[PDB]
Assembly symmetry: C3
Homo-oligomer: 318 residues x 3
C-alpha cells in the first residue's frame, strides 16, 4: 500500500460480521491492498484478515479452502495456520517450510457487528459509538454502497449541510428554507465536530456530528418524538473508490426500521448522483480547472480540507 502512514495506522470497516461465517472465505479491498478474510469452522472462531496473495507463485489465497484451522492455497496446497505461518508444503511433507513462507497478516477486530481492519500499527482505538451499549436504542444496518468517488469526497459530501434543500428536498431539506445559519465547527484532538444545527424538512430537527478520524462519522439527530444516531463508515478502496455503510440506532418504535432504511437509501442515492459527477475525482485541499470557491456555509467542509492537510493526507486528495 502507498497510502500515507496516518491513513495506514487507522481502523476501517471492511465487512459485516454476519457475512463472515465460520468456515467462510470472503474478500475486501482497502487502501489499494486486496484482502482475504477467513474463519475456521469452529464456533466463535476469530476472523483472519490477510493480504490476498500466496507468496509461492502469486495466487490469491481467497481462491483456496479452509481446512482444519488452516487456509489452503489452491495451486500447490500450501497450508497456512491462523497466524499466517505455512505449516505444510505437500510436495515435501516432512520438510519444515522456510520462514519466508508466511502470509502478510493485518490487524482485525469485530466491533458493533462490523469487521474493522488496520493495515499498519494501530495507534488509536476503533471509533466510539455510545448508543451501541444503550438498550433503549434499536439498531439496523444499511446495505453497502460501492461508489466511484474518492473516500474523502464521500466524507466531504456527508459533512456538507447546505446541499440538503436542493438534493434531499422532503427528507433533509426545504427549498423555502435554503438559508444556512452560522455553523459551529471545531477541529482539535477529538477530531472534527460540527455543533448543533437546525434542519428543516418541509418538522424541524436538530443535528450534530463528530469525526474522530477522517473516514468515520458519528451523527446525532433529535426530532420531536425521537433521537436517531448513526455511525457512518467509509471503506477507502483506493484513491478513487469507496464503500459506504451506516449503522443506525434510534429510540422510537421498532416498527420504524423499514421507513428509516428507506429514507437513508433515498438520501444516499441522491448523494451518489452528485459524488459520481464531481471532478476532479480526488478531494481538492486548500491552496475541472478553476480552484474551489468557499462561502460561509462551507465552514465545516473547509475545516475538513484543512484537517486532512494538517494530518498529512496525500492519498485520495489533490
Amino acid at each position: 500500500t502507498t497510502a500515507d502512514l496516518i491513513l495506514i495506522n487507522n481502523w476501517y470497516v471492511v465487512a459485516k460480521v454476519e457475512d463472515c461465517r465460520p468456515g467462510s472465505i470472503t474478500t475486501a479491498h482497502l487502501l489499494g491492498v486486496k484482502l482475504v478474510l477467513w474463519r475456521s469452522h469452529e464456533q466463535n472462531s476469530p476472523i483472519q484478515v490477510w493480504q490476498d496473495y500466496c507468496p509461492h507463485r502469486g495466487v490469491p489465497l481467497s481462491m483456496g479452502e479452509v481446512a482444519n484451522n488452516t487456509l489452503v492455497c489452491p495451486y500447490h496446497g500450501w497450508r497456512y495456520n491462523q497466524a499466517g505461518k505455512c505449516v505444510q508444503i505437500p510436495a515435501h511433507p516432512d520438510m519444515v517450510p522456510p520462514a519466508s513462507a508466511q502470509a502478510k497478516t493485518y490487524h482485525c477486530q469485530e466491533r458493533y457487528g462490523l469487521v474493522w481492519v488496520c493495515l499498519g500499527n494501530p495507534v488509536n482505538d476503533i471509533p466510539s459509538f455510545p448508543e451501541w451499549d444503550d438498550p433503549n436504542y434499536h439498531k439496523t444496518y444499511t446495505k453497502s454502497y460501492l461508489i466511484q468517488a474518492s473516500p474523502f469526497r464521500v466524507m466531504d459530501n456527508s459533512i456538507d449541510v447546505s446541499h440538503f434543500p436542493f438534493i434531499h428536498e422532503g427528507i433533509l431539506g426545504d427549498r423555502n428554507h435554503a438559508e444556512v445559519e452560522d455553523l459551529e465547527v471545531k477541529v482539535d484532538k477529538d477530531g472534527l465536530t460540527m455543533g448543533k444545527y437546525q434542519v428543516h424538512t418541509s418538522d424541524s430537527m436538530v443535528n450534530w456530528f463528530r469525526l474522530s478520524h477522517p473516514l468515520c462519522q458519528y451523527c446525532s439527530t433529535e426530532a420531536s418524538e425521537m433521537r436517531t444516531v448513526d455511525l457512518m463508515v467509509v471503506t477507502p478502496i483506493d484513491e478513487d473508490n469507496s464503500v459506504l455503510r451506516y449503522l443506525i440506532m434510534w429510540n422510537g418504535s421498532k416498527t420504524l426500521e423499514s421507513k428509516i432504511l428507506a429514507d437513508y437509501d433515498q438520501v444516499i442515492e441522491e448523494d451518489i448522483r452528485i459524488l459520481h459527477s464531481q471532478q476532479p475525482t480526488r478531494l481538492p485541499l486548500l491552496s475541472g480547472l478553476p480552484q474551489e470557491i468557499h462561502v460561509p456555509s462551507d465552514r465545516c467542509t473547509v475545516a475538513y480540507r484543512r484537517w486532512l492537510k494538517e494530518l498529512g493526507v496525500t492519498y485520495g486528495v489533490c
Copy 2:
C-alpha cells in the same frame, strides 16, 4: 486543452439549432473541453455555451435546471446569469456572490441552423455558405456521426477522391473505371481548393441519361468543407463540419442543399448515410489514429491522385496544427 491556438481560435459546430429548444440543457465536447449549452424558456432566447463545471464543488452545471433566465447548479443551487456570473447563492440569500463565482463562457453564434462555438478569441469568420439564402435551394441535415478517428483523418478522407470506385461502388464510383485524371489543386489565401473533377458513377436507372457528376470543393478552414456537385438535373451543395472532440475522436455532420425537387430529400439522406458509413469503416481502421503530416510504421506513400490530400497535409503544417496529427 492541448489544442493549438490556431484551432482554439476557430469556430466549430457542436449542435443543430433545432435540437436546442428554449429551456433546454445540452452537453457537448470540443477540443477536450466539456461544454454545456443552455437557453432560457423565452422564445428566440440565445444559446449560452460554457464549460460544464460549477466552480463551487466541481459538479457539472448540465445536471441543473434553467429557471428565470439563469442556469442553476443542482448541488447547492447557485444561479448563473446569461453572462455566466453567479447572481444568487441560496444559503446566503442577501450576500453578493464572490466575483470568482463565474462560469467559464465561450463564444456562440447560430448560423445555417447550426450552433457554432469558439473556445478562444475569434480571429476568423464562420465559413461562407452562399446557397443558404437562395430560395431555389431546399435544405436537409444529416444525423450526427460519432467517429473514433482523428478529425483531420475524417477530413482527409473527404478530400480523397481516388477511393470512390472501391468503397463507394455506385453512389460515387465504379471499380472498372478507377483511373483518376489529373487533379486541379490550389492552396492559397482562400484555403484549399480542388477544382472541377469528373465523377464517374454506376448507372441505377436504365431509362435515364448518365449522371455525369462534376464536383469541386473548398476548405477555408481545415475542419469545414464546402462541396459543390453538378449532376444531370440538379446542383447539390453541402457544408461538411467536423467537430474535433479531441485528438482521436470526431463528430461529423452535413448541411445539404439542392435545387431539385423537395421530394428527393429521402434519397439524399439515405445516399449520404450509405457513403458516410462506408467511409467510417475505413476511418475506424486507419493507423496511426492521428493524421501523419509530410516528412514504427512506414511513412505514407503519395501518388499523383493524392495531390489534394498531400496539399491538405502541407496546409496543416503551414497552419501549425500539432493536435490530432502526427
Copy 3:
C-alpha cells in the same frame, strides 16, 4: 515492437495450417505486431505472413480481399503480389508503383501442420518433433486458447509439476499422492530438460520434457506400453497475453483421440484459472508484492527463470 532480439529472431507458431484455407485472410498478433496471413485460391498455395498494414494510407490489408495471386487493399485497391510488392495502382494503371509500395513481409514456414513465423532473421531451425514421421503415431490438435497471461508465465505453468495433485486431480495426480520426488534438471546447449519423472493417477506414468527455446516444449509420457508426446507452442502476443496450442501424437488406439482432447481441455482450463489470477502478470525472474519462494520441487521452474535471464529476456518478464 520492443521485444528482445533473442525473441525476435526465433520462430513462433501463429496459426494452424488448417486455419488458413486457400483464398483465406486471417489475422494474428506476435510480439506486438499485427499480422495478416493470406493464400491465393490455388491448390497448395503458400501462406504469406505480413504486417497488417497498407503503407499508402494505413488501412489493414486484412480488410481487403485475395484476387489472383495478390492481396488487394480495400481503400484504393492497390494490389500486392505474393512477394509483397505492389503490382497495380488502379488510379494510375500505366504507372510503375514506387519502390516503397511494398508490404512488410516476414519469414514463414509450415511444419507439423503449424504456421511458423520469424519476425527477424532466424538463427535456429524450427524445433524437432521426431514422432511426426512415425506411422505408429496418430496426431491431433487442440483448439487455440487465448490466455490473459504472459507467455512466459504460461510456459512456467507447464514446466511446473508439483501443482498436478491440486488443480489436475484425476488426470495428472491426486491429493493422496502429492509428494514430489527429486527432480532431474539440466540446462545446456540443448536447452532445458526435465528428466524422467513419476506422475501419479502401479497407478503411475513416466514423464519428461525438453525446451530447445523458451516458448516451445516437447513433452513425452509413457504409461502401460502407450506413449503420448506433444509439441506445446506458445504465441507471445505481447508481454501480457498468449495463445496456447498443442500438437499431440500417441501410439495407442485411434479411439483415444476425443478422450485425449477432453483431458487436455480440462487440464488447460484448470491452468487458465490459476494463470489469470497470478500477479504480477509478467514472470518474475531470480534476483541478485513479496518475492517468490522456491522449494526443491521448484527446481525446473527456477531453472527456467535462470535460463530466461541468461538469454537476456526482458519482454514479458519482471
